[PDB]
Every structure is written in structure tokens, then in C-alpha cells.
Amino acid sequence: MRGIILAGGSGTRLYPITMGISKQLLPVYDKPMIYYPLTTLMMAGIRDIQLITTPHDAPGFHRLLGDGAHLGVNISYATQDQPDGLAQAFVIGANHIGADSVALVLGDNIFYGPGLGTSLKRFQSISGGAIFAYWVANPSAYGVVEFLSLEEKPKSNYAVPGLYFYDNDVIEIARGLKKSARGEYEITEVNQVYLNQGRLAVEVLARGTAWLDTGTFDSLLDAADFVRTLERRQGLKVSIPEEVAWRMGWIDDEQLVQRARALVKSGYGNYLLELLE
Amino acid sequence: MRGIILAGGSGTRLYPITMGISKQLLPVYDKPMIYYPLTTLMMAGIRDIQLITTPHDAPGFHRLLGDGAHLGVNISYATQDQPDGLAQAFVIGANHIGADSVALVLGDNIFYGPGLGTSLKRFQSISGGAIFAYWVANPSAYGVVEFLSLEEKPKSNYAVPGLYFYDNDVIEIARGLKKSARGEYEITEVNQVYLNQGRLAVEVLARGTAWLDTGTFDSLLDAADFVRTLERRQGLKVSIPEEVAWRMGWIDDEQLVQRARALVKSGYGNYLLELLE
Amino acid sequence: MRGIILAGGSGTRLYPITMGISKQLLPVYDKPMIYYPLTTLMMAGIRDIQLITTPHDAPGFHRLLGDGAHLGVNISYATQDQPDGLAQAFVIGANHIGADSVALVLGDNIFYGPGLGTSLKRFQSISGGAIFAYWVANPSAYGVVESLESNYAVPGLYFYDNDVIEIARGLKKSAGEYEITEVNQVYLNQGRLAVEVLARGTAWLDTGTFDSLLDAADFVRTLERRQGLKVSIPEEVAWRMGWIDDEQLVQRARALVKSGYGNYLLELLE
Amino acid sequence: MRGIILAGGSGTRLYPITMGISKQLLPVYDKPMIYYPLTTLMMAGIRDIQLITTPHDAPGFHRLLGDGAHLGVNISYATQDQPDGLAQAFVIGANHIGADSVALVLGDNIFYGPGLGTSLKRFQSISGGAIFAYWVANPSAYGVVESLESNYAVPGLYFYDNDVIEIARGLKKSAGEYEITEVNQVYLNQGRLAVEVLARGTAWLDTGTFDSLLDAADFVRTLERRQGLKVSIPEEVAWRMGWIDDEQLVQRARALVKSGYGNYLLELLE
Ligand SMILES: Cc1cn([C@H]2C[C@H](O)[C@@H](COP(=O)(O)OP(=O)(O)OP(=O)(O)O)O2)c(=O)[nH]c1=O
Ligand SMILES: Cc1cn([C@H]2C[C@H](O)[C@@H](COP(=O)(O)OP(=O)(O)OP(=O)(O)O)O2)c(=O)[nH]c1=O
Ligand SMILES: Cc1cn([C@H]2C[C@H](O)[C@@H](COP(=O)(O)OP(=O)(O)OP(=O)(O)O)O2)c(=O)[nH]c1=O
Ligand SMILES: Cc1cn([C@H]2C[C@H](O)[C@@H](COP(=O)(O)OP(=O)(O)OP(=O)(O)O)O2)c(=O)[nH]c1=O
Ligand SMILES: Cc1cn([C@H]2C[C@H](O)[C@@H](COP(=O)(O)OP(=O)(O)O)O2)c(=O)[nH]c1=O
Ligand SMILES: Cc1cn([C@H]2C[C@H](O)[C@@H](COP(=O)(O)OP(=O)(O)O)O2)c(=O)[nH]c1=O
Ligand SMILES: Cc1cn([C@H]2C[C@H](O)[C@@H](COP(=O)(O)OP(=O)(O)O)O2)c(=O)[nH]c1=O
Ligand SMILES: Cc1cn([C@H]2C[C@H](O)[C@@H](COP(=O)(O)OP(=O)(O)O)O2)c(=O)[nH]c1=O
Ligand SMILES: [Mg+2]
């Protein structure tokens, strides 16, 4: 399976913050936003990950991640020239995907808890498509699964999170789409095709899971508050790519220490040292 | 008086966040970090403001602020090629300053409360230099005024915040400095010259003032939590440059509404509309 | 003017917390809830204060407050045997009030900001009734002033003339409590209900749900950590009002050293 | 095994809050403090539980808890007349314990995470003494296990054999309280003090200062808002343990509808 992170978009619901910075480069406590979906793909066992970015934000991502070799992954880059929709991921990413299955994760999504770590590797064998469900108070704000049926932006309270697994048929499914009334090629339309053909699996996320989207002022700040709370109260750092790479055997002890040393002043590197001790 | 915002630096204490984004473009709840020192200079009555940035982060600042005309100010840009210290502001900014006095504000500083709004215009008449003092629990982390005496990074608990006003002599004072042991031209050395010559005024900030530096994970997140608390509990938005420009008469009603309309999706523009209603 | 704090009720929206403790003895960061409305009256210049409690919660209040001498005030107590409504304040407190005007504050309300401190003394010479207004997103949840049933909710602070006792014994129950709404209207039907909007930047909080209680505690701690302010500290207000001296404040501080509250009193004597 | 909760003490580090209320009746978001240690014992399989309170705070506890029938347990009470130390638990509770092993939990402690739920039943067949370890940045502030006086602090959860009564009546005061430290050592001098480190990812909280209380409340609400978990809800544990039925849980829910706590119980019956 190949991985793609959608890390473009305009981020209008964060203006004026996102007039100066990609949403995916915003801090969520102790790390950039893009670390969270990155580590989700890593935990699923995916090493060849393509980032889709805007042309203007790309240099920041390169500065942060480079080719991913320090995290034991192969990060590549594609450019999305206009924010024309999520389903463009499969068109832009077609050459990256090749003949393989694909995992798409949205750049503003955080997945934490039971069933959202290394157990996600079970999806590499996907045939058809596989998406998820999570209860929310304001479903009209989300894509909604009825339990059967899907609808963008009301009749189930289950939002569909931004993590999707597909077989190789997704590329041609995406290529056939037209822009919606709001001028975007829509992931819900991709999901509908699978649903209509009896080839869409859905699972509700496990009890005790946190799913977050950081695209509003309050949701960004709630996310950062959560991550800190985990550290201060449970002693846990979450979505640390160096640690994930280390535990998967993609980087060794010496590489981990070289990372720690570079990150000593903020405190982040001290965590990496503790992993060894 | 002319204004300069120090908006470069490496931001090492925020790594790996600041490997991807300038510290000055980070969110503090509902706006970018750079809005806070920007509005401090605006409230002091300063319209000609030069931003000093790194070469690599400059495009983000341009995208966000442009030439400042939409906020009724003249924003200009200078490039600092290496993060060689705060006191370089006066060398880099010498042509901007010309014959005038100058206000320097640090890009990571937030000033809120009594005495930190439009009353700051009293400093435009500065002769000599003028700095401030604020009680902190861990003074060894800061520049410290003894009450008399100054020291970078212990014997008063009063930190010197990142807001400085100088007469035109500062340029030549700065040009004469050498790099410290840590490889930076030091603002505390500028302040020392004024102090030694009997030309440094110091005021403790007023009771009820908040001074924040956002350069660690915890201080960034504490700042954002504070700003939201002000809104949710007291109904106050703070450091909104459009509002400051409007109240000073640098933008009119029509310009304010044009700003509001551009910022409708995040909620920020709704505040600007309410100002009119 | 005399003062009354409604410190009874059931507190049902905080069950099961308030099956063990009065809402008005709950902590809001560094002090009990009752300290907030108490300091509001104190800052309005009021020194003779009656607290209305339930029978079963009264001993807690006595242990915390005693007769108030230590805060330079006269705290009296009255019992409300059933939680039959807010307007019963003026029946229960009728003798406490006597000939004077009265200030009523609700036990679960926090008032903070411009015009909610020592400026409140101006309401002492009130004739008729004065209440307040605070813009809210959901006026249907509150009492609403324009009329009385706008986005303007009526907070739990009220100033009245001596007439108020009469009106209150007058009232009957509701669809059931003796309602403060009905008092205010009866004043408005005489056209002597004055309203003021709370100033820009004020915080008005009600601590009667899990989230509102916790939001309030967070707010108070934020004020300390970020602006170095401790708020509604009655010892401090007493000492600023001239009601207790430098030395009385020192003795308060010694009793409170272990929590850190006492250290803040010591700093007042720089 | 039998259980004891130390729910007395003065709570000096929370003055003036705890001049009006016991520390153990303070709210931690959506429930009283006492619910947390109570549910810890309940999850250890313990159903006969004695709460030790001060004389003056006891009525609050009775109103909240009664005899525990409604939570499928047997809650008894004992009075501690002066706050003379934690080891007095085993003197006061000596008859409650009788022939059995005992679980002691501190009233102001919250235990949350892996190995602090129904796994705790394994300590019922304890021989000797078992205590726990939690890494802290400032071990000087705590009791410290390696020996006993490392960065490993001893939380307020303890499992002992029937011997514990003997040792406890044995002890004398300290420089002054009857100390739990001294009990544990006396077991260690026999080499039968077992220690386990709390698992990665556990939260151990003590709510005895302004900041720690408020940090704990924030933590509990964060778990609900972000992971949809309500924690240490005794009704839920009773119903999962088989100690009360679908219908008993419904009746609990009706008494608690206004606060929202009751709605969570209804959702358990999906
Ligand atoms: C629309 C679009 C979004 N994205 C990213 C941004 C988010 O991480 C994710 C989901 O989109 P959204 O969360 O909608 O992000 P957005 O950039 O569209 O923001 P807003 O709607 O507030 O204007 O996909 C792209 O990479 N390309 C795109 O064309
Ligand atoms: C050192 C330096 C800082 N700055 C800015 C960044 C901050 O807003 C402000 C004060 O500096 P600091 O707060 O020290 O910021 P920094 O970038 O040096 O971060 P760190 O010390 O953690 O590595 O000045 C410059 O513009 N140019 C510089 O050469
Ligand atoms: C109804 C009533 C309230 N009060 C107090 C409690 C509050 O501080 C204030 C306003 O009442 P409420 O905020 O409504 O408090 P409550 O005790 O009625 O709780 P709930 O409504 O959640 O069941 O007045 C009394 O003293 N006596 C009473 O009869
Ligand atoms: C000392 C003592 C404490 N306790 C309870 C209170 C706590 O839940 C627990 C541990 O005690 P502490 O946490 O020390 O609580 P405290 O009441 O002694 O408060 P402070 O030390 O701030 O004055 O034991 C008793 O029941 N009886 C006692 O004699
Ligand atoms: C292994 C690991 C997991 N996690 C996170 C991912 C998940 O949100 C959560 C649980 O991970 P894991 O224990 O792998 O869960 P599961 O086996 O149920 O998939 O912990 C990290 O943040 N860092 C790590 O190094
Ligand atoms: C006028 C104004 C002030 N402020 C802030 C700046 C200060 O932190 C605080 C007080 O401002 P101000 O009332 O101007 O204070 P002072 O006259 O004492 O200088 O409010 C804004 O955030 N936005 C505004 O539009
Ligand atoms: C004097 C004082 C005021 N305050 C609070 C009361 C108000 O909420 C806020 C402003 O008080 P104050 O300065 O007395 O305001 P005003 O003159 O506008 O009435 O500060 C305290 O909390 N403690 C104090 O000792
Ligand atoms: C079963 C249950 C557990 N918990 C808590 C107790 C623990 O802190 C955490 C884990 O409980 P549990 O799943 O019983 O863990 P273990 O088998 O590791 O002992 O969840 C509740 O809060 N409520 C409940 O109903
Ligand atoms: Mg979008």
C-alpha cells in the first residue's frame, strides 16, 4: 500500500492565521500538525508517503521533512495548483500509487487511541474501500454515514473521519468525477461509488478514541490542550514520528540519538533520549 | 517615531514546529503571532513599521501582511540573513529609522492590559532609552533589571520585556557592539550603554498586565488559552489590527467592512462587523 | 442599605456533587463560591449581611464564615426550610432589612470587571429598583430585559427600596417557586425599575452546571497566572475598605499559610 | 478482602475552601472526589467498604452515599475524632477488617488507566503487603520506594494481610501523625512488601492543592470531551460487575437527569 497526505487547501476557517502559514504546519502543542497524519500512515506500515501541498507552502514542508530519511520513510512531494478538492489526491497521486492500494489521510486530522495505532496495518490488504465512523454533536458540519448511505454536510450523528483505504480502482473512480456546486472534487463521491457497488466497509472507531479536525480556531486550540493533557497527566507523548520509526525498525538507536541531539532545546529531544533509557 | 518588529530568529526552543514555520507566524488562538507586536506599535501611534525576517520565512509574511495598506499602516520589510542577534535591528533598520526615534518590539511578545494600549503614545517623545519591568518566578530565564543594573540570563525577579523605545543615538550604539559568547549582538548591551550614561528610564508594568513570550511549547499554548479565555469570559478580542486602525482613523467604515467580508468563514470578520453594529 | 445572599437551593444541575455539598461551598479555584457574592456586597459598601441557607448546609457556612468579624463585616444567618424560590429572600430577610434599602445577590453568581467593584456604592441611595443586563447568545435560558420575561439577560444582582418586602409577601408561586422576576416587574409596572448594561469587558458567571463551574475555576486561575490578579479575596477588600488593619490581615495570613492564599495577603503588605 | 477509605483530615493546603467542606466532597468535574477512591475499591472486587470521616463532615457523606445499596455495595461509616494520621485507619477499622485482608485507599487520590480497573481483583489473595510506584520529578515531596522514606513515589493505594491491624496499634506518632510509611517498612523488614510500578500511561492524581484539584477536574472533562469517556462512575461499575440491574440503573438515571450525569447512565443501556 502507498500513502498520500492531503496537505494543501486554503484553510479559510482559520483566516487570518492561514493567510500566513499552511494549516498543516500549525503547532499542535509540541509538534507540527502534519506529524499527526504522517504518523498515522507510518503506524499502518506505510513507508512510501506522498505529500500533496500548495505551490506556495511547499518550501516549509521541505524544510521540515526533506525526503523523510531521518524518520526512516520515503517522503515525496506533489503539487496541487488550486484547492480543487480532496478527490484530486488520487489523480495527482496516480503515479505514486502505481498498481498498489492506497491510504489517504487528511492533513488536519488527529487519530488517537485504541485501534488507531499499529493495528491499522490490517488495512493493507484492502479490497474495495474502507472508511470509519465517529459520533459527533453537530453532524451537519461533517460528512455523515447513515446506518447504507452517505451525505456531505441529517440522520445518524456519525461523521466520517479523514482516513480512507482503497484498492487500486480508486484512481479511475476519481478521474471520472465532476466538481460539485462548491467547486471541489468530493471524497464523498468516491466513497459513494464504492458504497453503491457493495464494496464499502465501515467501522465505528473504538470506545475511548479521540478523532480531531483542527480547522477552526476552537478545534485547533482544543487539540493542542488535549495533547498537552496527555503528557502532563498520563506521561504520554503522541504521534512522535521518530519513536514510531524506531519501534518499527526503520531507524536504529544511533539514528534516534542523532535526532534527539538536534531537538534538545525545546525538550522534544529529551523524550527521544528517554526512549533509550 | 519609527517602528521595527524583530520577526526572524531560529526559534530553537520550539523545534520541530519552527523547522517548518517562523515562530512569528504561529497561531495564538484567533490570529498569527505577529499581530500582537504589530498592534502594540500601532497603539503607540506608529504607522511606519519595518518587519525584520529571515530570507526563507519572508514570503509568508508578505502573503499575510503585504504593504499594510489594508490596516492603514506602512509595512516594509528587511532581511536578516543569519540570526545574529536582537541588536542588529538598529543596523538593519538604520535607513528605516533615519533621524527619528525608534520603537523596537520582539515578534514573540504579547502585551495586554492597563498601560499597554494607546497610552504607549507617550513614548514617542523619548530622549535616551525607555524599557520596562515585570515580575517573574524564573528570572534566570530572562534579562533582569535590578533596582541600577541589568543582566542577561540572580537578584531582582524583574524581567525586562521585549518592548524598547530609543532616541536616534541607538543606531551608533548598536553599530559599536561585538557578538557575545553565544554569537549574538545583544540588546542588553544596548540597554547597558544607556543605563551607564544615566539615560535609561525603567517602568514596572501596571498591576493586572499580562506579558507573554511565546517561544516554548508551554508558553505558546498558555498564551493561546489566555486569549480565548478573554473572549469566552469577558467578551473581548485583543490585538485586532483592523480594529486598532479603525479606532485611530487610519481606516474608515467602508474599509473595515471590506476586511470583515474577507474573514467571514473563521468568525474573525463577524467581530469586525459587530464593531460597526 | 442591607445585604442578603441567597445561599440555599437544591443545586439539581450539579447532582451528584450537590447531594454532598451546597453549590455555595464549592471551590472556584482558590476560594469557596460564597466568597464571590460576599465580596460583591462588601464592595457595594455593605457590612451587615444575611446569608440564607438550607437547614442541612448551614453548619459548613458557620465554620467558614462565623460572624464575619475577621472580614470586618457582620454576617448573620437565616434558614430557608424548603427551596421555594428566590423572592422568599425578602420574606425571610424582612426583619434583617427593616426600614432600609436592600442588596440581593445570588450565591452562585460571579461578577468581575469595570463597574462591579467599589463603584457599586452608588446604588445605596437607590429609590425604586435597579437591575442589570448582560448580552447572551441564548436569552431564552434567562430572564430577559428590554419589558421582562432582546439578548439581554438579568444577572443575580439586585438593588431595591424598602418597598420590596411588601411586594414579596404579596407574590404567589409559579408553574413552582416565588420568583424574583415577579418582583422586578411589579417595580416596572410603577415605572421605577432601572436597568444598566454591564460594562464592556465584564465577566458574569453562574456556576450551576458541571461545565460552568469548571469554566469559572479556570477563569479565576487564568487571571492569577496571566495578569497576577487574585480576585474577590474578602480579606483584601476589608483591608482596602479600612475595615480591618495591617495586623488583622497578618493574622489572617498565618492561618492560611499552607495553601498559598495567605502568602498573597502578606504581599499586600508589600 | 475488606476496604477502607480515608475520607477525613483537615485539608490545610486547600484553606479556605476546606474550612467549609471536606476535601473529599469537592467536585472533580461531574462527581464528588469520594467517587474516585470508592470506584477503585469497587473495581478491586470489594463490596464491604468503610469510610472514615471527621465528626463534622460526616452528615454530607451520609446524604451523598447512604448505605451504598444503590451502588450495589455496603458502605459503613467510622468517625475519626482528630486528624491523627493515616495508619489510624487500621485501628479505627480493626473490627470492620476482622479476620480478612484489607484494601486502603486515600480519599483525595485518583487512579486512572491500565491496571487500575477490574485487574485489581488480583490483590485480594494478597499475603503480606503490596504497594505501588509512580515516577515523579520531585520525589522529595513524597514517600519514596527503592528501602522506603529513586524517583518513585508511593501512591495512596495499599493492600495488606490481616497482620496490618497489629502493626498499626503498635506504632507511635511522628515528628505528629500515625504514619502509613511506618506500616509499609515493618512489612519490608519482614521482606514481604511487594511493589509494582503503575503501567505506562496511567494517571495518578492527588487533589489536595488549588492547582492539583483544578488540574484533575480539567483532566476528567478532557477525557469526556475528547475520548467520550466518563470515568469512575460508580453506578456504571456496579452495573458492569452485576451488582445492580438494567432497571436499578434506570432509577439512578431519573434522579440525575437535570445535570446530564443521568443521561450517560441511560446511554449505557444503549
Ligand atoms: C480542498 C482541499 C483540501 N485539502 C486538505 C486540507 C485539509 O487537511 C483536508 C480537508 O479539507 P478541509 O478541512 O476542508 O480544509 P480546507 O483547506 O478546505 O479549509 P476550509 O474548508 O476551512 O477552507 O484536505 C487539500 O490538500 N487540497 C484541497 O484541494
Ligand atoms: C536571535 C534573533 C531573534 N529574533 C527574534 C525572534 C524573537 O521574536 C525575538 C527574540 O528572540 P528569541 O525569543 O530568543 O527567539 P529565537 O528565535 O532566538 O529563539 P530561540 O532562542 O528559542 O532559539 O527576536 C530576530 O528577529 N533575529 C535574531 O537574530
Ligand atoms: C430556588 C432557590 C435558590 N437559591 C439560591 C441557589 C442559587 O445561588 C440561586 C439561584 O438559583 P439556581 O441557580 O436556580 O440554583 P438551584 O439551587 O435552584 O439549582 P437548580 O436550579 O440547578 O436545581 O439562589 C436559594 O437560596 N433558595 C431557593 O429557594
Ligand atoms: C492526616 C489524615 C488524612 N486523612 C485523609 C485526607 C486525605 O484523603 C488522605 C491523605 O492525607 P493528606 O493528603 O495529607 O490530607 P490532609 O487532610 O492531611 O490535608 P493537608 O495535609 O493539606 O493538611 O488521608 C484522614 O482521613 N485522616 C487523617 O488523620
Ligand atoms: C506505538 C505508538 C502508538 N501511539 C499511539 C497511536 C494510537 O493512537 C495509540 C494506541 O497505539 P497502539 O498501542 O499501537 O494501538 P492499537 O494496537 O490499538 O492500534 O497510541 C503513539 O502515539 N506513539 C507510538 O509510538
Ligand atoms: C483600543 C484597544 C485596546 N486593546 C488592548 C490594548 C491593551 O492591552 C488593553 C488596554 O487598552 P487601552 O484601553 O488603550 O489601555 P491604556 O489606555 O491603559 O493604554 O486593551 C485592544 O486589544 N484592542 C483595542 O482596540
Ligand atoms: C478593590 C478590589 C477590586 N476587585 C475587583 C472588583 C471588580 O470586579 C474589579 C474592579 O474593581 P474596582 O477597581 O473597585 O472597579 P470599579 O471602580 O469599576 O467598581 O476588581 C477585587 O477583586 N479585589 C479588590 O480588592
Ligand atoms: C470498567 C470501567 C473501568 N474504568 C476505568 C478504570 C481504569 O482506570 C480504566 C481501565 O479499566 P479496565 O478496563 O477495567 O482495566 P484493567 O483490566 O487494566 O484493570 O478504566 C472506569 O472508569 N469505569 C468503568 O466502568
Ligand atoms: Mg474545505
Ligand SMILES: [Mg+2]
Ligand atoms: Mg478539515
Ligand SMILES: [Mg+2]
Ligand atoms: Mg534566542
Ligand SMILES: [Mg+2]
Ligand atoms: Mg522570546
Ligand SMILES: [Mg+2]
Ligand atoms: Mg433553580
Ligand SMILES: [Mg+2]
Ligand atoms: Mg444559578
Ligand SMILES: [Mg+2]
Ligand atoms: Mg496531610
Ligand SMILES: [Mg+2]
Ligand atoms: Mg493528599
